[PDB]
Design a protein around this ligand. Structure first.
Ligand SMILES: NC(=O)c1ccc[n+]([C@@H]2O[C@H](COP(=O)([O-])OP(=O)(O)OC[C@H]3O[C@@H](n4cnc5c(N)ncnc54)[C@H](OP(=O)(O)O)[C@@H]3O)[C@@H](O)[C@H]2O)c1
Ligand SMILES: NC(=O)c1ccc[n+]([C@@H]2O[C@H](COP(=O)([O-])OP(=O)(O)OC[C@H]3O[C@@H](n4cnc5c(N)ncnc54)[C@H](OP(=O)(O)O)[C@@H]3O)[C@@H](O)[C@H]2O)c1
Ligand SMILES: CCc1nc(N)nc(N)c1C#CCc1cc(-c2ccncc2)ccc1OC
Ligand SMILES: CCc1nc(N)nc(N)c1C#CCc1cc(-c2ccncc2)ccc1OC
Ligand SMILES: [Ca+2]
Ligand SMILES: [Ca+2]
Ligand SMILES: [Ca+2]
Lengths: 157, 157
């Protein structure tokens, strides 16, 4: 099973402020929607509750609480090891899609990074983890918008 | 000025049937929308007249005719050569977006390929050039849909 990771990171490393992404970069959302289309996303409970289950994708959510869902495209797991063990039974690809805790737990085990760098230095308390040294960028594309962003893909090895 | 290229190619190599793309793979057009958001697109007159000027994009349309457009996001050029001459003075990135004639003319000049391979073998009369030998794939992701597709980015090197 391949693991990808997708994130939008501002210039100071901030990805979140409380439950919110502290910016709106028009157009950036399209990258996320396009790459995650009909994919399994692995997300932490906080991100999942805040974002909700968008249509046309499937969610593996980790929680230590009794959090539940009645959406047929959502699976709730008590641990990451348990999410990954079960996902490997039904898919060959999972996209880690946040938040801070989940990115930090899994970045050493992912194969491909999708990083949109957002041209802003906002206030926030949720940061993206340091990127392991064996990752290298293989593709870059700049976008001009209300807030500028740059999309970059990284491969391990 | 960087040159990219973006195309959806069916499994037998067909990219077009008359003025149309002979398939509908749900989700694939999201990739097109995402990558071309607020970008300059170089297109041939027939593809332009057939697809129209989608919003949040700029178009450089080549024609040997006196074809005109009153769309504020559309520039018309008498040749591909003159389009490139002018585009390099007003942007740093252009995405070659079809159709067949335009792909044939520019494939040897572009830096990056965005290719969506569409899991279908349709009727059609328009094909894509052979991919130049110095291009290598650097990213791949598969998508399950009504028609499956696979997205691959190629770099020259
Ligand atoms: N900029 C971006 O691309 C982006 C993308 C996604 C999210 N974000 C931001 O990131 C912030 C949320 O991140 P966060 O780090 O606070 O929370 P989070 O990673 O989304 O979720 C944390 C929660 O996940 C559960 N969890 C974490 N590790 C677990 C484990 N090993 N086993 C079982 N459950 C586990 C716990 O749930 P319980 O509390 O239920 O026990 C924990 O409270 C938000 O601001 C969000 O907007 C930004
Ligand atoms: N599958 C995909 O991802 C994709 C994407 C785009 C298009 N397509 C397909 O491609 C097909 C249409 O392509 P096509 O090859 O027939 O036509 P085209 O490339 O879209 O347009 C050709 C026209 O461009 C102008 N032109 C070409 N070279 C020129 C030059 N050097 N200088 C000035 N003008 C030049 C001429 O316009 P004038 O006639 O006005 O002189 C020519 O008729 C359609 O079936 C469409 O669906 C597929
Ligand atoms: C679109 C940014 C984004 N970009 C990239 N490159 N990766 C990501 N992981 C996210 C993200 C995220 C998480 C996220 C997404 C949305 C969202 C709202 C409306 N349409 C789509 C998504 C809302 C809340 C949210 O977390 C509070
Ligand atoms: C989704 C196609 C597409 N997919 C891929 N992978 N590559 C491409 N090059 C194109 C293409 C094209 C041609 C094209 C398509 C649209 C379009 C219209 C309505 N919804 C989405 C797109 C607009 C203008 C345009 O050229 C003037
Ligand atoms: Ca943490
Ligand atoms: Ca770290
Ligand atoms: Ca020419």
């Amino acid at each position: 099973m391949k693991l990808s990771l997708m994130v939008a990171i501002s210039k100071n490393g901030v990805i979140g402020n409380g439950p919110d992404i502290p910016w709106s970069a028009k157009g950036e959302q399209l990258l996320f929607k396009a790459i995650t289309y009909n994919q399994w996303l692995l997300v932490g409970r906080k991100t999942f509750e805040s974002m909700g289950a968008l249509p046309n994708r499937k969610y593996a959510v980790v929680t230590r609480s009794s959090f539940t869902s009645d959406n047929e495209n959502v699976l709730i797991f008590p641990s990451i090891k348990d999410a990954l063990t079960n996902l490997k039974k039904i898919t060959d690809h999972v996209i880690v899609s946040g938040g801070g805790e989940i990115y930090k737990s899994l970045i050493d085990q992912v194969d491909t990074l999708h990083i949109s760098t957002i041209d802003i230095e906002p206030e926030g308390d949720v940061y993206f983890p340091e990127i392991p040294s064996n990752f290298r960028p293989v593709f870059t594309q700049d976008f001009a918008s209300n807030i500028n962003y740059s999309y970059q893909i990284w491969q391990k090895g």
